Amino acid sequence: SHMFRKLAAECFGTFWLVFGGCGSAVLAAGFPELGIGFAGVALAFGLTVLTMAFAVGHISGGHFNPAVTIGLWAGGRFPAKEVVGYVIAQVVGGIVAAALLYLIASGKTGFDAAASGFASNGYGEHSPGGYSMLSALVVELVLSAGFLLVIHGATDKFAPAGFAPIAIGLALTLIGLISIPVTNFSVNPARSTAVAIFQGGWALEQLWFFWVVPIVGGIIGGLIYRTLLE
Amino acid sequence: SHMFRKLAAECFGTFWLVFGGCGSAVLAAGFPELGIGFAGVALAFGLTVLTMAFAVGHISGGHFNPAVTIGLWAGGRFPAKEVVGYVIAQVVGGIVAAALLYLIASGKTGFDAAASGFASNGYGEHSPGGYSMLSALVVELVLSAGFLLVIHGATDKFAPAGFAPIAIGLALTLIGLISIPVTNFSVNPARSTAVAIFQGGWALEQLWFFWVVPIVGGIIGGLIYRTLLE
Amino acid sequence: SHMFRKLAAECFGTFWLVFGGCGSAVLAAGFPELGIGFAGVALAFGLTVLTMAFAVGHISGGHFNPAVTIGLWAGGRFPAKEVVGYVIAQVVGGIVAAALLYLIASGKTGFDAAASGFASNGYGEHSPGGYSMLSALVVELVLSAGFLLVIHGATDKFAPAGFAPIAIGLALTLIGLISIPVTNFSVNPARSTAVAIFQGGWALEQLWFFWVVPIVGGIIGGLIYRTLLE
Amino acid sequence: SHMFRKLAAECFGTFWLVFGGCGSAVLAAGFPELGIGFAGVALAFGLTVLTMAFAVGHISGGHFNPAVTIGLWAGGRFPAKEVVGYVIAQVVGGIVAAALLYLIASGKTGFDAAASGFASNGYGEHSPGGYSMLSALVVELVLSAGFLLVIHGATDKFAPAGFAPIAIGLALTLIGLISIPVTNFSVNPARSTAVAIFQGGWALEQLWFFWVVPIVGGIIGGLIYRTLLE
Ligand SMILES: CCCCCCCCO[C@@H]1O[C@H](CO)[C@@H](O)[C@H](O)[C@H]1O
Ligand SMILES: CCCCCCCCO[C@@H]1O[C@H](CO)[C@@H](O)[C@H](O)[C@H]1O
Ligand SMILES: CCCCCCCCO[C@@H]1O[C@H](CO)[C@@H](O)[C@H](O)[C@H]1O
Ligand SMILES: CCCCCCCCO[C@@H]1O[C@H](CO)[C@@H](O)[C@H](O)[C@H]1O
Ligand SMILES: CCCCCCCCO[C@@H]1O[C@H](CO)[C@@H](O)[C@H](O)[C@H]1O
Ligand SMILES: CCCCCCCCO[C@@H]1O[C@H](CO)[C@@H](O)[C@H](O)[C@H]1O
């Protein structure tokens, strides 16, 4: 390969994840009477990873998420020296998606990124269901770890080949089905950053949480698989 | 093979796509209280491609969509000389499905293709959610491109064999989960043409949009995979 | 094998299909506020076939449906001399499921098989959405044929191995997403017979329709694949 | 392997099953207007098994359920001498998940495990839909058996390799789509025990039912496959 091809793969991948997951949230989740709800948004997120893990996993590894890249580092599956590049690529790709999404959302009368939240992640006063900071920590930490345990397990040498995109993408949908009401569903700092920039207020103030927690969580997940299961 | 067998495969395939996707929209999406919604219609579309990509992909390649055929051309995966045949086959198959659908829908009191839209694609005044022409362009262009990037990636030499119908069909569902509110969900000019003919007014007047945009989009998608990822 | 093992497989399979599909309809579809709707029932039907096609397909072929058995006969994939046995096994298995379902449904105050329809298939006055006999014919005929075209295609020599239960089971879900409002969703005479016996009135009077149409449809589907695609 | 690695795999697996299935029920099922419903909870349960069967099935066998372990024993697929260890591991993992879930749920004003039921399984007066003890028996018994018949079938020597997590996990979703209204959906004594401890009243009093029935059911399922199908 070239590192170029993979960075491009991680960029387009993460663009897809934010464009489709958050796009479904901003455009479709709450459409009157026929809209897709939390379940639909959780399905869309998972499908973005399933579809691009099959399309470009064989190029980059198909992370699309800085907590994945860093957790694969910690699990001994990914070299330290490529981490930063992946993370930049992921972040940039997400930003470009959020931008196009914002443009799309603006073509409907009454749109307002700041007031609606633009699908940004938050806790306490900004949890969709009114959950505390501690509820948000526990849920992003466990779900992050489990996501990474699934990613390690499903790509294990002895895991039957080819199925990983289904396991990994459906694991993200599951995570969505649990967590939207607590944090508006992250486990991914590039996904949180992308839309926080356009929400423009509280989302930027809590954004640090959705860097630290999902990463510590993904590190833990990696360490669990490597030291206890592999 | 014979070119006959494949054209038949592309025809039946596209018939299935319109009969099931648009059929679910016209018959089931809005059924009171128990109807399937946008999420259900997005699932049905994706399943039509998943199921016929597994059934007849090994015959024709399983495009079922003129933007797919033309994007595979641009991506260097499909010969120029078979394009037109595929596109005619796709269009004809879709028309026959729309016709049977119209017959089916007419067996219920109060049906009216023109007033309900017969699941036709539109923008501005005819976007289901009131989105502008520019919102519609950006969304059909990005989603078209991404669809084709997924189709190229998932059928890459190095993509694990056999899984492509799942990636491709679920990618279409994802696209549905995002876009119904903006354009009533196209990325497919045969799907747009099929029902526009029976809607019979505005749908025919905007039909040109849902030829040009999804194609330019599918070309871009192909060019991205070929020049930057493959 | 023994013919015993396969008949048992076809019996348990069809029991599963009726117990889960119709069970989900009678127990869960319309539960206030949280019930699963037409989409949920369509998913359950498809999952019964996906799960038992993986569990016992390698024994019997995994038909679970007299229109499948007879359409595989017509498509040249299944010997005439085993048809009747399969069909009896399928019918018996469905009846035993309907019976247990009726017992389960009766443990809730107010249950009434005859008035609710017990998820029976009907047309005209007994179509859930008020569709005519002709709308019901066209929809059961097309969907039956397509189901059988998918079953033939997905189990073709050149179809990648192992995936057929996913294609076939998801094809049934798709069929459910389209057709519930027209006929309450059949494409399967054992599924129609099972519950008609407990509905006990109109369902028995229209039951003949849901033998003839799905079969003619499944025959057509088989003939299409064999003569035009294979 | 080490028995350690597998017990860890069964523990984390079952933790995932309770954290995600019951978590989705307690956090997301009934969220106003956008919540995921019974269908969403049934999807989440199934996805927990699909995702961890792919991640750790190759280590432990991926049971995550004492009725699975004991039914595989009865079906001649799993040695008597490892049963108890698995069952303890499963139970412990579920308890730790219920505990974290309770902590998470408590960060929202008005939460109350005892009054809401904390997603506990019950019958009669504690069936979500008002079903009798007999309705609950028949449904947990049939669904348990079928679950185990699917698990045996899908992991049969002659079942195509690698697909079992999809069959098994989707079988659990199906089971969820049928049974929530009757028993709040068990077929798993560790899943019932986990949350009963935090519900703290009636759930503990009926907990015995959701040990005995799912086990007798899973034994029957195993015996059916071994003696009649294999
Ligand atoms: C990988 C490159 C992106 C790094 C993520 C940026 C983390 C943002 O951190 C945020 O920014 C502000 C800093 O003054 C604080 O006010 C906020 O409370 C905090 O959320
Ligand atoms: C990779 C890009 C990361 C961007 C992180 C920027 C952190 C923004 O920080 C935010 O700045 C805003 C005004 O400029 C204010 O509304 C907030 O109070 C402040 O926390
Ligand atoms: C990687 C992005 C920054 C992570 C720093 C870890 C510790 C930060 O700690 C937090 O920083 C917040 C934002 O400024 C403060 O508002 C909080 O009081 C503080 O607890
Ligand atoms: C592949 C064969 C089908 C070609 C697609 C036809 C494109 C239709 O183009 C349409 O038709 C009219 C032309 O006068 C215009 O009035 C409409 O505004 C335009 O949508
Ligand atoms: C492959 C078949 C493509 C059919 C495209 C036909 C373009 C139709 O064009 C339409 O004709 C209608 C009346 O005849 C009018 O209602 C519209 O104003 C006009 O744009
Ligand atoms: C392939 C089908 C036609 C594509 C032509 C590309 C440029 C068309 O351009 C458009 O044509 C519309 C329909 O007539 C006009 O109404 C619009 O003003 C015009 O912008």
Ligand SMILES: CCCCCCCCO[C@@H]1O[C@H](CO)[C@@H](O)[C@H](O)[C@H]1O
């Ligand atoms: C495979 C064995 C089962 C055969 C299916 C039975 C078809 C039932 O046929 C039915 O029965 C009655 C016959 O007098 C008629 O009154 C009904 O209108 C007709 O639906």
Ligand SMILES: CCCCCCCCO[C@@H]1O[C@H](CO)[C@@H](O)[C@H](O)[C@H]1O
């Ligand atoms: C395999 C079993 C098939 C059973 C088909 C039986 C056909 C029943 O036929 C029905 O009998 C009922 C009363 O007995 C009446 O309500 C109906 O008018 C009559 O059509």
Ligand SMILES: CCCCCCCCO[C@@H]1O[C@H](CO)[C@@H](O)[C@H](O)[C@H]1O
């Ligand atoms: C396989 C089950 C019977 C199929 C017979 C095919 C032709 C039946 O024909 C139909 O029979 C109905 C039921 O008696 C009558 O009520 C209808 O008038 C008649 O059209």
Ligand SMILES: CCCCCCCCO[C@@H]1O[C@H](CO)[C@@H](O)[C@H](O)[C@H]1O
């Ligand atoms: C594998 C280790 C856990 C065993 C499961 C415990 C079964 C609980 O059994 C319960 O406990 C009480 C006993 O006095 C009774 O009052 C309850 O009615 C009964 O549900």
Ligand SMILES: CCCCCCCCO[C@@H]1O[C@H](CO)[C@@H](O)[C@H](O)[C@H]1O
């Ligand atoms: C593996 C752990 C299994 C725990 C099973 C414990 C059985 C509890 O039993 C319950 O005790 C409660 C008060 O302590 C009472 O509310 C109930 O009446 C009683 O049945």
Ligand SMILES: CCCCCCCCO[C@@H]1O[C@H](CO)[C@@H](O)[C@H](O)[C@H]1O
């Ligand atoms: C494995 C957990 C205990 C299973 C014992 C099987 C028979 C129990 O039997 C039941 O025990 C209940 C709980 O105490 C009583 O309340 C019921 O009356 C009794 O029928």
